Amino acid sequence: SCVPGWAIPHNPLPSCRWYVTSRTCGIGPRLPWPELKRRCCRELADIPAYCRCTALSILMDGAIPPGPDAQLEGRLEDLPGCPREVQRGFAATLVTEAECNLATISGVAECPWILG
Secondary structure, eight states: OOSBTTTBOSSOOHHHHHHHHHHHTSOOOSSOHHHHHHHHHHHHHTSOGGGHHHHHHHHHHOBOOOSSSOOOBOOOOOBTTBOHHHHHHHHTTTTSTTTTOOOOTTSSSOOTTTOO
16 A cells, blocks of 8 residues: 555655655755744655655655556655765654654564665
């Protein structure tokens, strides 16, 4: 069920994109750091524990759901002086107790396969 439209929303984790770009790229919404973080973690916890790593994966590398239209969902693209590799490295740490501290399918707050 961990697919956009099903257990995962279409265009997943809008606020996490911004928090990732704010930190790495320096460009983001005009919101205080804690607010930026909170909104990201909120959207993340609203996703079933089991689908949480998949969601990160989609936000990082994007996804293409089958269908007549099928548009590219998520994915972190390059920003002026902010390559996609920098953003990805930080995005991978979102579930960490350091960041959002949320449990995945493993029951532990970590996604070992996400990065790379």
